[PDB]
Design a protein around this ligand. Structure first.
Ligand SMILES: [Cu+2]
Ligand SMILES: [Cu+2]
Ligand SMILES: [Cu+2]
Lengths: 358, 357, 355
């Protein structure tokens, strides 16, 4: 692919070194194509940590919006003089400020943890780096970069012990390490529950939840909306488009398909969806997504430029055509009022519909 | 050879506009690098014959609209809300991005003209028009989907969809003729020439809408202003502190002179006619003269217009008489009386005649 | 000097027709390297004026935040219908709005004035121009560009008196000129850095910082401005900024800085002297040492400075002792007592002595 808006999961760059888990990096949106220049300063990172693990502390040149797509975790980050710690749930959304030192705990013994993060670099556009205070055989501590003279004077500690301190770190391999279930238990505004949002619509064929920045202060920094959609098997999300937001969508679970009308006159942009896949819906593009016939398709999405965004549906009871006056409809479609009704007033549900008519 | 002057004959016209015309200004960064600062801005001119209907569409761009001729009823829908407005000459209004918009000219005689400043929401300086219902050379975006998706979503047989679409490639053009009986049935805005920020004398008139006072202008962060320069007169040399002004010649002829220090100073100048567009980057001192035979009417978009201040270099209000006596003497190497003689002999402001009195 | 974040003073471009002083321009941060693309639209200007001088009025297509790094001055600028005038002291910080016509007075008899300016262009990214109403032998007045028709009509003044107006300016050499001390006296708000609530000082150095949250005039460029004096033989402990990218100017002295740069890490370092400028992108941990023989005095502009947080890696205000006990132990693979040993035995903050 060879699809300008579609990113297959095996195209993700896997961090070397990962250890007891894996960290994957999505490439730059402007790497293979120029059609995504509008969001060049956005990167996607997927973190997965094994049961009973500890993610080493670090900070990065980027703001972050985090979605827990699998399992649970305890997330803690420090900044200046404040420390904040939260127990994160499935579908929980949390913000981690740029420069804040962050570490993660997987306190569960059975279910593997997965986190999907949208990053907004503060330095060079679309470029970020991770800074580790304590490293491994394969991750250098940024403290070890300084000359010995600086460190012994700054910390007021003898030279011999500092190199003991650094050798203790070149013992472990990976920024994700195995840990006791006993220490991890001790280490335990707030998280945003997607399936608890007021902005939602659900029927027999799917459910939709969305957290908009206007109601959540922590989403106002990156100016981003975060939404969740489950399309039941054999169903679809009806054709619609976003007025303003450019949505980056991650396939959490299942398989399916999407069709997009792209004028970059028009052309049908389409791709097969599977777990780990990522695709982008630039604003204005009308989009339709179908689940598979045998399993549900579950998606989480990040809405870049999400303030005051409006989702306009082209089919269903809430469709926009239905807001035109009768004369406007007739003039636009070159048909009488009743033959227009036969097209835009025969669907009784919204958002999600079955591929087999009823 | 002028990097800031866009002659009307350079505008690209849309194919099969029908009962009217839609013209597109090139991207400001296409022929030159000197306008990189306003890369994400496009100018579109809509023009509709009497008794016409502009087909509904939306675009991936915010819009500020100025009616420069005639009357119109503008309607746009978004989600479940519809807003409709009766727009006259000099009315200024915003159409939100993603909103499905259509325009009506219910006037039986006056041709409609709309001048639009667009601010793309996707890729910088790039926008597209999405038509729900199209024509022979404009495709409906609904027809792009596979049939199985359309029949399932709309709950409508394949047979009716195939005919829904053919009824659209019967008309040619995104602007169509309509009956005034149906046009009449289909019946906030900012009036420029009612603004508190205005100045008027016998040599010209000026009106300006600032984003600080109008909320719909703060989305694009733009000021909208209008200037009519009476024939034989001129708008005195002045400059904008921060705003880069895009000017459209609505009517008349004339000329502009601007002091440009880019690729020390140099006189950039061009003669103006209707449909012409020229750009005034912030800091540039600019002077505009009407012709001897007709007034010059201009409409301007002030990009980055919040907290902007227009500084005049000549006239009653010129910035130089804000200096104390000692500063002017020190700066100009001249006594107080030889200086007053230069910067205190113009009794009017904004607009002056080319023959002094 | 092979350092992508370091700009030696001898690289500054000086305006030729400076006159009774000098004006230096830092190159665009994106000229030699791609590593500072994020601050593309920022320029540094250093103004130096001799005693008893008058800086001729001009405006520019750029916002500016000014810091007085030497001496005293009277700054005045006009815009639309307003006139604004201020007496500036050493360490004073002030904003000059874009498009405002400004001129500067040094009415001091022997201490030369120095001003360091950070500019934020309003037009093309990282590009600005200076517009002089009245010029000099090698500097055009922008009025002289217009046709004679326009000026005589606009100003209502005969041509001969315009053409003598311009000649009176083509006699002076330089845009900074000599002026009587008594007339400069006739020609007579700012943020005082050393009076900010956000400050820390010990025996080895002092630090002052003015953040945009507390001063409205810094919110236009969205920048924090700070000052640090590291006394000889001492150093400012390793630390990093959460989001602000700081442009630092060496006011006086010599020294050195070490920076951990992952652009997998590597040690970026350079010797500092007066006039030198170096950049600290967000996230980068930075350590600065004064010289053995003289103090090191620095001025810094924090681009994207709102809600910035300075995190120290050594001292009592250290960021690591905010981690939980089990977190530190797991993170450092050591018992709590051997960890205390390293991150709790420095008793001061910000500044500590070397050897
Ligand atoms: Cu597209
Ligand atoms: Cu220019
Ligand atoms: Cu670096």
């Amino acid at each position: 692919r060879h699809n300008p808006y579609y990113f297959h999961s095996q195209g993700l760059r896997s961090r070397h070194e990962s250890g007891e888990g894996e960290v994957k990096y999505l490439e730059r949106f402007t790497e293979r194509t120029e059609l995504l220049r509008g969001i060049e300063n956005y990167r996607v990172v997927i973190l997965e940590a094994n049961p009973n693990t500890f993610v080493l502390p670090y900070h990065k040149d980027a703001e972050s919006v985090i979605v827990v797509t699998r399992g649970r975790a305890t997330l803690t980050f420090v900044s200046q003089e404040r420390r904040e710690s939260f127990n994160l749930e499935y579908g929980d959304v949390i913000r981690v400020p740029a420069g804040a030192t962050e570490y993660v705990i997987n306190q569960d013994s059975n279910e593997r943890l997965e986190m999907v993060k949208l990053l907004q670099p503060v330095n060079n556009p679309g470029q970020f780096r991770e800074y580790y205070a304590a490293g491994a055989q394969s991750t250098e501590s940024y403290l070890r970069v300084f000359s010995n003279d600086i460190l012994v004077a700054a910390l007021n500690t003898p030279r011999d012990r500092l190199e003991r301190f650094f050798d203790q770190q070149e013992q472990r391999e990976g920024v994700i390490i195995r840990a006791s279930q006993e220490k991890l238990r001790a280490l335990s505004g707030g998280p945003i529950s997607l399936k608890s949002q007021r902005s939602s619509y659900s029927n027999q064929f799917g459910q939709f939840f969305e957290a908009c920045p206007e109601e959540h202060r922590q989403l106002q920094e990156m100016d981003v909306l975060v939404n969740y959609a489950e399309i039941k098997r054999g169903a679809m999300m009806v054709p619609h488009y976003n007025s303003k937001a450019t949505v980056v969508v991650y396939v959490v679970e299942g398989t399916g398909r999407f069709e997009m009308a792209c004028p970059h006159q028009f052309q049908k942009v389409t791709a097969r969806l599977a777990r780990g896949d990522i695709f982008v819906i630039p604003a204005g593009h009308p989009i339709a997504i179908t689940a598979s016939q045998n399993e549900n398709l579950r998606l989480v999405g990040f809405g870049i430029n999400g303030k005051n965004n409006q989702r306009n549906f082209l089919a269903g009871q809430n469709n926009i055509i239905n807001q035109l006056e009768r004369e406007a409809k007739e003039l636009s479609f070159n048909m009488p009022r009743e033959e227009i009704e036969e097209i835009f007033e025969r669907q009784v549900e919204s958002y999600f519909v079955p591929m087999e008519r009823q």
